[PDB]
Amino acid sequence: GTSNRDWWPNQLDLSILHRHSSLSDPMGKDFNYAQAFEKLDLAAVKRDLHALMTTSQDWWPADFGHYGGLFIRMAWHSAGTYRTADGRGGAGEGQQRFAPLNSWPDNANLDKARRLLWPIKQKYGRAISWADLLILTGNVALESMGFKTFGFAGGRADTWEPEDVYWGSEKIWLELSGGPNSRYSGDRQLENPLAAVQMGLIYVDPEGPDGNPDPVAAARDIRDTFARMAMNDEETVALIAGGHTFGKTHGAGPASNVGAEPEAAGIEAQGLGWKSAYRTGKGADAITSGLEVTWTTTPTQWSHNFFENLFGYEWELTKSPAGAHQWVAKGADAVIPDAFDPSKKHRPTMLTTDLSLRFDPAYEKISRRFHENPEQFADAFARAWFKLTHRDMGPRARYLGPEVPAEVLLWQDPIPAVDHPLIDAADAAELKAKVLASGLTVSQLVSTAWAAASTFRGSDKRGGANGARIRLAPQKDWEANQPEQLAAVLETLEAIRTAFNGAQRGGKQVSLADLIVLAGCAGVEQAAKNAGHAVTVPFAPGRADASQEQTDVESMAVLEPVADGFRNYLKGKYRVPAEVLLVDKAQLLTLSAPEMTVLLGGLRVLGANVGQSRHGVFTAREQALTNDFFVNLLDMGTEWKPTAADADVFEGRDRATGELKWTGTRVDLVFGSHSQLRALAEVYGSADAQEKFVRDFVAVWNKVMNLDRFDLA
Amino acid sequence: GTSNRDWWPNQLDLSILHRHSSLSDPMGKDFNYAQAFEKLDLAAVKRDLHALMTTSQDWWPADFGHYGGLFIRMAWHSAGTYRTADGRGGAGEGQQRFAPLNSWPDNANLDKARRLLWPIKQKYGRAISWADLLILTGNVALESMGFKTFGFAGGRADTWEPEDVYWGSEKIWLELSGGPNSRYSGDRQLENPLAAVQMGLIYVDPEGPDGNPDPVAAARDIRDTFARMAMNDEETVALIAGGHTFGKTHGAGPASNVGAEPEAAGIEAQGLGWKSAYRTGKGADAITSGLEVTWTTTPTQWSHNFFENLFGYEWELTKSPAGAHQWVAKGADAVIPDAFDPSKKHRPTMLTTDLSLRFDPAYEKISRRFHENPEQFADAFARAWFKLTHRDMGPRARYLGPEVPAEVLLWQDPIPAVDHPLIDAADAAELKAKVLASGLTVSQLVSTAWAAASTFRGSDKRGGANGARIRLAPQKDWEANQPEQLAAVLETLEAIRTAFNGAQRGGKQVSLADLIVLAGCAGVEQAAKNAGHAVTVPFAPGRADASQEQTDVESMAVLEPVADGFRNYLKGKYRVPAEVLLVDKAQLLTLSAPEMTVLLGGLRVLGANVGQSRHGVFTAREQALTNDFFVNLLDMGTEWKPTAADADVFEGRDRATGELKWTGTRVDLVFGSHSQLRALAEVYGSADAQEKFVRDFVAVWNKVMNLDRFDLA
Numbered sequence A, B: 001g002t003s004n005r006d007w008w009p010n011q012l013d014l015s016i017l018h019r020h021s022s023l024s025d026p027m028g029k030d031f032n033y034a035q036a037f038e039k040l041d042l043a044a045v046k047r048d049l050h051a052l053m054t055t056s057q058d059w060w061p062a063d064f065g066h067y068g069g070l071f072i073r074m075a076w077h078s079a080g081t082y083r084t085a086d087g088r089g090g091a092g093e094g095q096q097r098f099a100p101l102n103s104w105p106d107n108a109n110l111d112k113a114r115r116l117l118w119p120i121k122q123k124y125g126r127a128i129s130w131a132d133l134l135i136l137t138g139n140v141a142l143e144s145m146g147f148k149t150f151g152f153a154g155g156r157a158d159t160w161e162p163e164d165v166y167w168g169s170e171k172i173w174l175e176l177s178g179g180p181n182s183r184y185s186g187d188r189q190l191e192n193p194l195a196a197v198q199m200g201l202i203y204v205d206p207e208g209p210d211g212n213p214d215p216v217a218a219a220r221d222i223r224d225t226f227a228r229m230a231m232n233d234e235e236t237v238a239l240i241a242g243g244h245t246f247g248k249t250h251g252a253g254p255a256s257n258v259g260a261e262p263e264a265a266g267i268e269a270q271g272l273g274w275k276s277a278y279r280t281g282k283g284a285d286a287i288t289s290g291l292e293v294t295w296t297t298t299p300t301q302w303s304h305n306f307f308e309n310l311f312g313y314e315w316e317l318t319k320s321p322a323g324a325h326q327w328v329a330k331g332a333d334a335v336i337p338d339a340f341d342p343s344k345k346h347r348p349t350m351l352t353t354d355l356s357l358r359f360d361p362a363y364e365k366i367s368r369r370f371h372e373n374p375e376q377f378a379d380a381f382a383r384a385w386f387k388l389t390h391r392d393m394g395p396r397a398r399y400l401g402p403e404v405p406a407e408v409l410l411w412q413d414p415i416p417a418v419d420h421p422l423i424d425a426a427d428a429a430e431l432k433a434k435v436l437a438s439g440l441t442v443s444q445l446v447s448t449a450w451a452a453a454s455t456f457r458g459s460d461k462r463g464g465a466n467g468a469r470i471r472l473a474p475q476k477d478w479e480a481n482q483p484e485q486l487a488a489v490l491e492t493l494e495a496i497r498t499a500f501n502g503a504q505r506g507g508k509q510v511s512l513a514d515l516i517v518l519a520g521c522a523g524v525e526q527a528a529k530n531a532g533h534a535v536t537v538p539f540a541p542g543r544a545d546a547s548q549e550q551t552d553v554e555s556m557a558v559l560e561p562v563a564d565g566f567r568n569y570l571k572g573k574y575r576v577p578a579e580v581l582l583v584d585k586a587q588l589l590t591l592s593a594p595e596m597t598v599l600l601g602g603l604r605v606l607g608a609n610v611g612q613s614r615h616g617v618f619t620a621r622e623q624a625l626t627n628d629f630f631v632n633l634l635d636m637g638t639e640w641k642p643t644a645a646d647a648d649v650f651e652g653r654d655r656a657t658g659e660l661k662w663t664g665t666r667v668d669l670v671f672g673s674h675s676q677l678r679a680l681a682e683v684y685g686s687a688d689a690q691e692k693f694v695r696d697f698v699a700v701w702n703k704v705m706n707l708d709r710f711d712l713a
C-alpha cells in the first residue's frame, strides 16, 4: 500500500510525538505502577528467580546447569543500548521486548531468556514490570552466584510500543564501516548520537574493529563507545571483567545454520527466533554470536579467575567452530569445564576485547590493580552495575522498594533533602509581586525559567529546574542561556530570596530553584495582564538547591541545548533541518504536537528568543501573552521568501505593497507549511481562541516547569 | 534513519488503531463539536460565503469574477474519494486538507480554494469544522449561481491526522494500467476496495481510459467507479452534467510549467503548491488539469445549456494548449465567454467523459430525458448532490442544523422513529430471564448479537444493530451469520418479543433490535456466572426495527463480512494475510489494540466462532467468561506447527509428550507472535488479570453494541 512516507520521504514526521497514547495502553488511565510495585513481595519474587537459575527447560537447556550468565547478559544488553548524547535507550522502558531491539543480532537468544521469565512475570502480573524484572533477574543471577550487589531500585513502568530512536542509517545488519551509510568519518569518529560501532550491536565488535583482531585497536572502540554510554575507564574495565567472570559465548557450528530473527520468524515460532539447524539447535550445540569462549574455571560462581587467566597466560589467535576470531591459552592445561559433558574440559579462551583490558596501557593499569586487589574489583563492579542498570531511571525520588542504596552518587545529579517548611500560596503571591517590582522584565523572567526547566529530557529523566544548576558550571555559561543576561537576573533573584528568607519565622525559606520557576510564573502572569487577562499560573514549591560539588560538570555537557526551536536557537549549522530538531526537542520534553505548537507561539511573543532575535516575533505587543504568532503567521496578506544572505531565514512582506513586516526561521514557518502543524496553528489563530490559547499556554508552561518533579508523583 | 518498517516491511502494522489519539487533538477531551455547531449562526456563515463568491483575490483571481465553479469542484472532490467497499474516504472528516489528498494531482489548485476559506474558518473558529465548511461552501456556490439545493446537515467533526487508507500500490502518480502494481486485471476489473482508475484521481481520467479518447470506453470506467461510490446511472448523469453546468477547466500552457505539489513544496510556499511558471501562473493563465474546456454560455449561472450543447453539436477531437485530448463543437460560433477578457469568446468544448453521457446508450437515454425535461434534471441533481456530500455521514440522528431535509431517503438506511415508552431496568431483567429460560445457549446469544452489532463501520457510520436488519435480506443469509442457526435464534426471540409486547400496558413495547442486543447481554451474564463471577452488562434500549423496504439489499452487500477474525471467519482465500484483515476490521469497529485483544480472547471462549470451530478455543470451559485464551495461548509447554494440509492452520502440542492440545489459525496465533500484541496478551494472561479481563471485556462488548447509537449522543 503506498504511504505518505513513500510519496514525501523528507516531510517532517510528527508521529514520534503521539506514541504512547492511552489507546495503546492496556492498563486503565488511573493505573499507577509505583503503587503496584510498592506492594509487591520483592523477596518472594527473588526467591522464585533464585530457583529459576538452576531449573533448566529442555527447549533451551541451561549451560552448566545454571542460567545466571544468560541472564546477566540479558540485563547488561537491556541497559547497554543507552547513549548519553540524547539519553535514549537503556533498560528503563523494557524496550528489549519490542522491535527492533528484540531482533538485533547482539540480542540473539535473549528471546529465550525473556521467555524463561514468563512464568514469574505471569505470577506477579502488574506488580512487577518487564523493565524492572529484566534488571532484577540480572541481580538475582549475580547474588545466586556469590556476588554482593550494590542494591536495586524498582519503578521502571512498562511501555507498550517501540520508541522511535535513531540507531543509524545502515540498511544492512552489522555492516562494516565505510559503507554508503557509514556511521564513521574522519579518524574513526563515530556520529552523534550513536554509541555502537555497527548497526545491531550493543557497543563493539567482539572480534575487534570491523573484524580485525587487534586488542589494541579494539580498546579504542571500547573506550569511545563506553564513554558514549557514560562509563569511564575504571567502570569499563570493572564491567567487562565482571560480566565475563560468568557463563560462556555460543558458537558450536557455522552461523549459516541460524535462521530468522524474531521479527522475521514465522508465526508458529510464537515470538522466538534464531532457530538453528545445527545438531540439536540448543544447549551443547548453541549458536548465538558464533564465538566459543568460556572465561573461567567456575562459570557459575563469582571469582577472580578472569584476571588470573588474562594475566597468567600468553594468548594465541585461533577460530571458533563458526570461523570467528578468538584467543586461546595453548600452554594451559584443560582446566575450564564443559557446559554439558562432565568428562570434557577445555583450555582458557578470551575474546579480542577481553585482551584489550591487558594490552591497552591505560586499561592494563586498572586491570592489574583489580587482579591484585579483587575486593576493589568487586566493589567497582557492583557500583558500575548499579550505575549501568539505573543510569536512565531519573532522580532518586523515582526509586522504589527495600533495596535502594542509601549512598548518593555523583552521577545521579543529586538534589539535597528539604528539611524546612515550604512557602504557601500567600508567600508565593508575595514573591511574585516582589519579582515584578524589581524591574525584571517579562522577557527576562520567561527566558530564565525556560532555560532552567527545559533541560529536562524524558529519555533518561535527567535535567529540569530542580537543583538550580542554571547558576552553576557549566549551565551558567551555555551560549543558549545568555550568560551575561542570566547572571544579572540571578543576582536580582538572589537578593529577593535573601530578603524574603531573612524576614521569615520558624524555619520557612525558599530555594533559588523554586524562586527561578516562581519568577517565570510571575512573568507569564504579567504577560497575560499586559494582554488584559487576569490569570494565576500554578506553582508547586519544593525544589532544592544543589552545590557545585554535587554537580559533575562533564556529565552535564550532554544536556546543553545546541538546538532549541523554542528559543529560535541553533548553535551551529547542522545537516538535519531545524524543524526536525524542534520535533526532537519536543519529544525529549514529552510534548505532544498541540503542546509544542501552543508553547512555541507563546514563547515567541513573550521575548524568549536567544539574543532578542526578532525571528518569529509576529506581534506588535511583545511581552503580552496573545495568539498573535498564529494570527499573523496565517495571514494570507503576507508573502514569504527566503533571504539572499541566508536561505534558512525568510522575509514576510505585504503581498500588495512589498513592505517588510516580519522575518522568520524554518522553525517559525514550519507552522504555516506542514499540513498537520498548520491545522494546529489554525485552531489557535481563530477569532474564538484567545482564552483557549492562554489556558493551553499556562498548562504547558506549568508542565515544563514540573517535568522533573517526581517528588510530587 | 532506518526504521522497523525498513527491516520488517511485512510485520503487521498496529499504528492504524491508535490514530486520532487525544495526543494529536488540539481540542480538550470534553470538546463536543455538535454542541458548538448547534450554536453557530449558520445564516451568518452563509452570508459570508455568498460575499466571498465574488471577492476575487489577486493571488488566485476568480474566473468570470465568481469562485462558484472552483468551490463546487472543491466540494465534489472532498466527497469524491468515498468507496462503498469499506466506507473510507468521503467528505465527512475533512481529509482533503491532509496528506496525501491535499497533494493528489486531481486536487490541484484546490489548495487555493481552501485558503480562500481561511478568513471564514478563522472568524467562526471551532463552531464550524473544515469538513462541514468545504461542503457548505459548495452549497452556497450552487445557491449563489441560481441552483436550489436539497438541504445541508452539519456535524462532520474535524480530524487532526491523515487516515490510513489503502489508495493503491502504484509508486508513480497517475500511472496507467498494467504496470507492476496494476490496479486492473482481467477484463478491466478494478481491485477492491479501490474506486478510481489511477493513483491520485477522484474517479476516472477525463481524457478517456488510460488516456485513450473513446467516450464509449470512458463510460464503462465512469459507471464502474461511480457505482463503487454508491451512485447509479441516473445519479451519475445528473452529477456530471450538473457539475459541468458551471465553471471551467484550466490548461492554458504546458504542464511542465507546474511545480511541486503542496507536500513537496518549499516551506515558503506556506502550505500551497503547484506554483506555475506559465505567464502569470494564475487566472487567465491557470493550469490545473491541463484541459481547457468551458461548458456553457453562462458559466456562473444555472442553465440548461450543458445538454443543449452536448446534443446540439457534433464533436471533433482536438488538443488543449497543454496537449491534452478534448473536444470542440464542429461548425459552432464563438458563443462561450472568456473567463477574463470581455472581448474574447470561444467555441463550445467538452471532455471525453462528458461525451460519454451521449455516446453510452444507457446514459444517452437519461441525458435525453434530462434535456427534454430539465425540471427532472434539476431535481435529480439536487438529490444526488445531497447524497454525494452526505453519504458518509451516518444515521440521520447525526445531522445537525436548520437545513436538514425532512425527507427520509433509502440510502440513509433509515430507522423508524420510536413512538412508545421504552422498557426499563425491571423489564430488561424480566426479558433476560425469559431469554435464558428459553434454552438459547451462551454461544447462540453471543454469536447473534455479535453478528447484528459488528456490521458497523466508522468510516461511513453504516451498519450496527439498530434496525434489526439481521432478520432481513441480505444479512439473514450471509454465510458469516450462519443463516440456519440464526433463523432458529430469531424465531425464539420473536416469540419472546411477541409474548412480552402482548402482555403490556399502554403503549410499551420492545423492538426485536433491542431484544437481540439484550439477549446477547444475557448470554454474557450467563457466561460470567458459569465462570463463578457476578457481572452486570449494561444495556441501553431505544433501537427500532427497520423494514425490508427501508433496507436496500444491493447497498447492504458491501457490509457483508467476508473476513471476521472475531469469529475466526474467512469466506475465501485472499492475498492479504488474515491478521492484516483482523486489524482492518478492528479499525472499522473503532477498536484500539487493547480492545481488539480482549474482545477476541473473550469471543473465542464464549463460542462465537462460525461453525463451532475449535480454532482458538483455548479453554476446557467453553461458554464461561474467563481469560483462558490468553493463559493457554502463552503457555510455553505447548509447541505450535503448521499443518501439512493447510499452512494457515496450526497444531499446538504438548512439548514433552506430543499430545495434541489445541488448533489455531493465524488470527489466533498472531497474539502469541507479534511483539506488541503478545505484550497485550501477557497483561490479560497474568495471574492477577481475571477480573480486569472480565471488566474490559464487558466494556468493549458494550462499546460494540452501541456503535450506531447516535440517538444517545
Ligand code: HEM
Residues within 6 Å of the ligand: A063, A068, A069, A070, A071, A072, A073, A076, A203, A204, A205, A206, A222, A239, A240, A242, A243, A244, A246, A247, A248, A249, A250, A251, A287, A288, A289, A290, A291, A353
Ligand atoms: C566490550 C564489551 C563487551 C563485549 C564485546 C561483549 C561480548 C560478548 C559476546 C560476543 C558474548 C557471547 C554471546 C553468545 O555467543 O552467547 C558475551 C557474553 C556475555 N557477556 Fe559480554 N561483552 C562485553 C561486555 C559485557 C558486560 C559489560 C557484561 C556485564 C557486566 C557482559 C556480560 C556477559 C555475560 C554474562 C555473557 C555470557 C552469556 C551466557 O553465559 O550465556 N559482557 N559477551
Ligand code: HEM
Residues within 6 Å of the ligand: B063, B068, B069, B070, B071, B072, B073, B076, B203, B204, B205, B206, B222, B239, B240, B242, B243, B244, B246, B247, B248, B249, B250, B251, B287, B288, B289, B290, B291, B353
Ligand atoms: C466523470 C466524472 C468527472 C470527471 C472526469 C471530471 C473532470 C473534471 C476536470 C478534469 C475538471 C478540470 C479541473 C481544472 O483543470 O481546473 C473539472 C472541473 C469541474 N468539475 Fe468535474 N469531472 C467529473 C465530475 C464532476 C462532478 C460529479 C461534479 C460536481 C457535481 C463536477 C464539477 C466540476 C466543476 C464545477 C468544475 C469546474 C471548476 C472550476 O470552475 O474551477 N465534476 N471536472
Ligand SMILES: [Cl-]
Residues within 6 Å of the ligand: A088, A089, A090, A093, A095, A163, A165
Ligand atoms: Cl528509548
Ligand SMILES: [Cl-]
Residues within 6 Å of the ligand: B088, B089, B090, B093, B095, B163, B165
Ligand atoms: Cl478516510
Ligand code: NA
Residues within 6 Å of the ligand: A087, A088, A089, A090, A092, A392, A458, A459, A460
Ligand atoms: Na532512555
Ligand code: NA
Residues within 6 Å of the ligand: B082, B087, B088, B089, B090, B092, B392, B458, B459, B460
Ligand atoms: Na469515510
